[PDB]
From Swiss-Prot, chains A, F, G, H, I:
SMART domains: Proteasome_A_N (SM00948). CDD domains: proteasome_alpha_archeal. The N-terminus is blocked. NCBIfam families: arc_protsome_A, PRK03996.1. Component of the proteasome core, a large protease complex with broad specificity involved in protein degradation. The T.acidophilum proteasome is able to cleave oligopeptides after Tyr, Leu, Phe, and to a lesser extent after Glu and Arg. Thus, displays chymotrypsin-like activity and low level of caspase-like and trypsin-like activities. The formation of the proteasomal ATPase PAN-20S proteasome complex, via the docking of the C-termini of PAN into the intersubunit pockets in the alpha-rings, triggers opening of the gate for substrate entry. Interconversion between the open-gate and close-gate conformations leads to a dynamic regulation of the 20S proteasome proteolysis activity. The gene is psmA. It is found in: Cytoplasm. The configuration of the closed gate contains an opening large enough to allow rapid entry of tetrapeptides but able to impede the entry of proteins and longer peptides. This is Proteasome subunit alpha. It holds the Pfam family Proteasome_A_N. GO terms for molecular function: endopeptidase activity; threonine-type endopeptidase activity. GO terms for cellular component: cytoplasm; proteasome core complex, alpha-subunit complex.
Length: 227, 219, 219, 219, 219, 227, 227, 227, 227
């Protein structure tokens, strides 16, 4: 009887409505990423859909800068509004400081925005989690921003329906500073071990940066190598 | 594997089985109900144009026994065919959730209607305990007939009794139980046609209690 | 095809059938109820202006038997004619939805009223189990009469009993069951006229439970 | 035409008929209840100042029979007159709507009160099944009297029994059933005056369940 | 005229009549309950200091009969006096409205309490049908006494029976029914004082269920 | 008990009120479109109504520019308010950038507008889906914007009551770069295979653009050819 | 349980509160109109009321300009507020463009106003439908604006309690370009065939325009001719 | 279950809350008025109350100008707030146009004010009806403004608990252009025939205007003549 | 079920919430006043309380000017907020017109303030009634302002729990133009006859004005005379 409003705690002291937005994230497809020797990558599972769909607009990975990028999971409407807010906040940070100096308060803008809606009635939260990744003045960054707004810097994570299984794999297999290729194949194995039996891993979008370089997205045949 | 057992249930009792039951009800069951109703009509007047004595307490009316047995076999067949539709709907009741129960409520409503059908198809004596509708006879028609008749036959045969109201009570057992048969067939016609309506309008939500295209919304 | 079977039900039991039942109730049924009521009035006074003995426990009162049989045939006809309207309404109960049930609630209300009619038209002994309204006799009028009379006739005929209250109890069986017949006919008049009112005001929502011109709004 | 049949019902049982019933209750019924109550008062003391033997189990007390018969005829008249008001209200229950039921709820409340009147005017033995108020005797007063008395008279006459508590139980049947008559008349006075109050305050909403001047608002 | 009949009811059964009943309860009824309670106390010990035989099954205990008759007359008087207050409140229940029922709810609450009083003042055997509170004896105290005693007296007198538990069961009938009388008088004391409290705190809203000075607000 | 407010999630994390607006779309008549060799078209089913109705105002297809057009399905009130917002948004984009440079953020404006109402209490969503189509600086475009706001670039789609059957057909029959006529007849077959048995396809409105040209709507007798 | 708020859809996706405003329109008296050879007319049924009422203020037909006019059906309070808004919007259109150039966006002003209240909580819709008719730069116009706001250009319509029967008649009898008199008598027959048995058609207000002329309302004795 | 909010329609399409404000009017005492040969009057029943009350402040008739006046029925609090708004709007009309040119849009100000509160939640309507009457540039005027806001020009009306009986009388007895005295006595007979049996008509306040003259209120002894 | 909001009427047309604020007034102690030969007075019952209380701040009578004064009954918090608003409105009236010219629209300020809260949701009414009294340009004034806002000029009144009994006494005993002393003793008898049996009238605060003079409050020993 308490899980109807965003502004009511429970006898344990729980915000169920926030947790149900977190459950809405869990219905999205798995997307992971990690940092390595001079840079970070991102991997995102895509169960291949209608060939009528222009492939340009089903990419869960999105460029928020030449030097910051992210991936979502959850509601697609809220997901797109969020990556829009990430882009606009990157531009505001870049115009007030001359450059996106550190990725952290880009994600703070996004995080405070997502947090505020977990507090006021008449508003629902965003049912999306986001994984940011890029290069700044400090180096490789990797965050995750959840529906409640909580951000944490990682060396590897996932989001989506697999998230527990992927972080379980990476929790016992990931070793830092892998050269890019070896890192990618480790992350592919991580993504593989989150599916159910009988499911064949289709082609997932994967993209990376190294320190001093810009973004690139591996096209489908460079992806096709690690199948 | 669990999904294998669920699919093993659903492939075994499927929608074509339930709709074959609905087709059999829509044609044959209804004319058989009507034929037993007309037989009850004729037997009631056959009892009505008569005056009884001790000799009618010495032999059971085999025509009335046959009418009761036909109605009893009809109720058995209608009960088993209703249980078929019950199983078809009940093996497709989905995972219990606090929302998304729109088509689940359709399943509970149609199962509630089939409950009414088989609670007025299953048999009962005069229970004298319920405040609702007293159930027309059901399965125990020939049982209740022979019990209530055998009591009066014991009282009439023994020396025997001298109550003329007891003899006319035997006559009223005969006429009244045929009357109850024809009342019961009229109400079973009503109820069967209601269940046919309910299935033929609700079968889509009965088989698919919820439709999922969440990948359009959740990606 | 499913729509063919639904149309086959609805063309078979339609609104003109239900309204023909309502016309028959509005004229003939009511004067037949009133005639049986006046016959009960006359038979009650015929019992009242009498003092009984052993000879009245030796022959059943065929006049009272005829009054009970007329009321019983009336209740059978009223039950079957009510079941006609029940089927007409129940084969037009639409697809189960959580909204849009405005005319569906009209159907449930009118079916609830016809339920009251036939639950006080169907018969019952003194059940001694319900806290609601005890049902006036119904279908088993002549049955309950002959049973309750035959018990006292057995006690009076056998040597016989010497209780004068038993003899006056037989007299009170006669007068009281005619009194119950006339009570029952008065209440059936009330209930039949209530159902006639309910149908004649609600028939549009009974036949069309919801009106759809969604192409004006949804294009 | 349907409006012709509705108008045919309402012109037949109208408000002046119901208010004539209320006038008859407000004068004559109440003094007749009081007269039967005083007769029960006198007969109770006539039983009380006596000691019985075998001779009082050999003849029924015709004075007590007359008091019970007067109360029974009163309950019959009050039931039929209540059914008149029931029909007058029930043939003016409007079209079933989910709103606008302000005066409809007045009709359901007054029908509920008349239900209480006639459920405590209709008769009942000691049912031993209800947790609510046990109904004061009703229609079967003389029936229940003669049955419960004839059991003890059979036990006393036969050789006869030697239980003095059985003889005093016969005495207590006599005194207790007159006591039940006077209890029942007091409660019927209370209930009749409650129904008179309810009708005379609610008759406007009973006859017009909703007032329509929508052409002022909807043009 | 209708207002004349309403005023004729209310002037006939008024607040001074109801408060005279409350005064009679507050003094005389309570000491009469206490006197019958002390008589039950003394008679219970008079039974207790005794050992019975066949001779105690040959004569009814007139002292216990007198105690039961005093309690019975008390319950009759308390019932009729409660029905007086019932009529006084029930002839002032106003026009049925969906709001403004603040003092109407006070009337329904006090009538509910008087219902409890008279449902535990009216009599009942052991019904074995209710899950609520079993009613202390009520009106049929001497009836239930003589019935349950006469059964055991028949079994003891006839040759007679040889069960000593039957003789001690007769003894326990005597002691247990006096015990039930004193239990019943204690509970009736509690209930009468509760009803006296309810009337003396609620009489203003019982007589005026709503106050109207609308001309201050609506002009 | 959770499908009463726009701002409450469920134990799965579902927004039913948004889904019921999507169900309101499903009650509208089918309308499809696809791109081809230098251009895009749109097809819209119309069960022919009252001849008292001026045919100029029952067109589900509407010109938002000489170079962007769309078609709706759902509530007709919300439908018209939406095509109005699309027009005004096209004019604002055209005045701030000199021309409608890319169709994409015309549809982003419409999308963000439709998304916002799926988040705040005291507001209901739009029960309309829109299919945009035109030529920009990039070329043939084809989007669909749903009640939640979600936009996706396609090569072919439908909306409305047939949508699943039409996308099922096009999913196994559509081949890109058809010359305009062959494309139209493929789309007509797609629209045909979504009706129920006994229903005869009446005359549907169909319109197209090629690269460098303006709009044209095939009149009823050029439509009458492909019956 | 969903027909209590203006902002809640249903399991089908219906807005019942809007539909109940449409039901509130249905309790108003029938009013029809059609265009003909150079012009449009309007007919409005009036069951003649209290002779104490000044007849100047029971006219369902109202002049929103010398060159636009309309008629209502539904709640009389909302009806008058609406014809006021139509007049004020005609004046604003006339002052910003020099003249009421086209009737269509006068009715767009009224339509957007009526639509907005079918979307926000704390506001109920207007329970009125309006039929606009006049001459513009284009020619004879004829619209109907319903509670949800939906406008459609017709050649003939009705509103009110008869609407289905009148549009049913006109749907099989109306032929365009009738000379004014013949048109009026056709519309009178249309209005006649919507009443119930026993009801005699009283005197209805009827008014028309031709191209290049102003308004005129047929007085009661010119009306009395066509009885 | 729908008669709790001002903003919810019913399955018939009824605004019960507005009708309940109209019922609140019905509990006020009867007040009538009519126009005659050059002018209008007003009559108002008053069951004579406490002699401690200064008679200057129980007058249901109130002067909103030297040339407009009105009378109320319903809630006394809302009644006085309404006659205040009528006075203030008369002054605003008089300052923007130099004079109260027409009474009609004084009553439009009052009517739009009363209508607005029948539409927004968190506000209740006014439970008062008002009868305006005066002389303008046109001549004798007579309106009634109800809780929903609906105004109508009459030649005679009443409001209050008698209203149906008084308008029933005037509906079969009133003849226009009576010389003032004869008109007043007709209106007194109208007011008489609305009481219940046994009730004696006490002294009612009555006031009038003729064309070119100001207001006057008949004092109690000029009233006492027509008893 | 309708007595929960300030904005909902009932099947009779009643505002119960306003009536319950009027019931909250009824729990306050009785206070009366009347005008006489050149001036007005006020009498207020006080059941004498804790001697720890400074008697300066239990005075139900309060000076809103040297020439206007009042007395309250009901909620003490709302009572003090109201006498504050009366004082501030007296100062605003005095600064815009140079002097408190007439007491009437001081009480109109207070009345409109108290009325407004009987209309909007999210606000409760004031549970206080006020009796104003003083001398103006006109002479002796005496008003009462109730929770709904309704003001009435009287010659004598009371408020509080006795109000009916005091106005019942004064309704058959009060005669105007009494010399001050005789008036006071009549009002004391009025206040006496409102108590219950056994209750002894303690010392009540009484104050008065005459025309051309200022205020004075009879001290406890001038009060002690009339016991």
């Amino acid at each position: 009887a308490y899980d109807r409003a965003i502004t009511v705690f429970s006898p344990d002291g729980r915000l169920f409505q926030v947790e149900y937005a977190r459950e809405a994230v869990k219905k999205g497809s798995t997307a992971l990423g990690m940092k390595f020797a001079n840079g970070v990558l991102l991997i995102s599972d895509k169960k291949v859909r209608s060939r009528l769909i222009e492939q340009n607009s089903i990419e869960k990975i999105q460029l928020i800068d030449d030097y910051v990028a992210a991936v979502t999971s959850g509601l697609v409407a809220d997901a797109r509004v969020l990556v829009d807010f990430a882009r606009i906040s990157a531009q505001q940070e870049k115009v007030t400081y001359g450059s996106l100096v550190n990725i952290e308060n880009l994600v703070k803008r996004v995080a405070d925005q997502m947090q505020q809606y977990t507090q006021y009635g008449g508003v629902r939260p965003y049912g999306v989690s986001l994984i940011f990744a890029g290069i700044d003045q400090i180096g490789p960054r990797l965050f995750d921003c959840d529906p409640a707004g909580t951000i944490n810097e990682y060396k590897a994570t996932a989001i989506g329906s697999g998230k527990d299984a992927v972080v379980s794999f990476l929790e016992r297999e990931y070793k830092e500073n892998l050269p890019e290729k070896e890192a990618v194949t480790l992350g592919i194995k991580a993504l593989k071990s989150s599916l159910e039996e009988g499911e064949e891993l289709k082609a997932p979008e994967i993209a990376s940066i190294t320190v001093g370089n810009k973004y690139r997205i591996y096209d489908q045949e460079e992806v096709k190598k690690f199948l | 594997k669990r999904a294998a057992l669920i699919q093993n249930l659903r492939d075994s009792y499927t929608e074509t089985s339930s709709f074959a039951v609905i087709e059999e009800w829509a044609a044959g069951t209804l004319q058989e109900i009507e034929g037993i109703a007309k037989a009850a009509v004729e037997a009631h007047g056959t009892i009505r144009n008569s005056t009884y004595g001790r000799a009618q307490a010495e032999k059971s009316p085999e025509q009335l026994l046959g009418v009761l047995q036909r109605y009893q076999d009809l109720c058995h067949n209608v009960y088993c065919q209703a249980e078929t539709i019950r199983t078809v709907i009940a093996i497709r009741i989905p995972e219990h959730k606090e929302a998304d129960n729109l088509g689940v409520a359709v399943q509970h409503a149609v199962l509630k209607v089939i409950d009414e059908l088989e609670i007025k198809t299953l048999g009962s004596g005069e229970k004298s305990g319920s405040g609702g509708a007293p159930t027309p006879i059901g399965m125990y028609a020939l049982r209740e007939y022979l019990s209530a008749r055998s009591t009066v036959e014991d009282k009439l045969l023994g020396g025997g009794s001298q109550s003329p109201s007891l003899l006319l009570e035997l006559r009223q057992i005969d006429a009244d139980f045929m009357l109850k048969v024809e009342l019961a067939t009229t109400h079973l016609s009503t109820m069967v046609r209601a269940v046919i309506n309910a299935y033929l309008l609700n079968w889509k939500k009965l088989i698919q209690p919820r439709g999922g295209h969440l990948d359009v919304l959740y990606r």
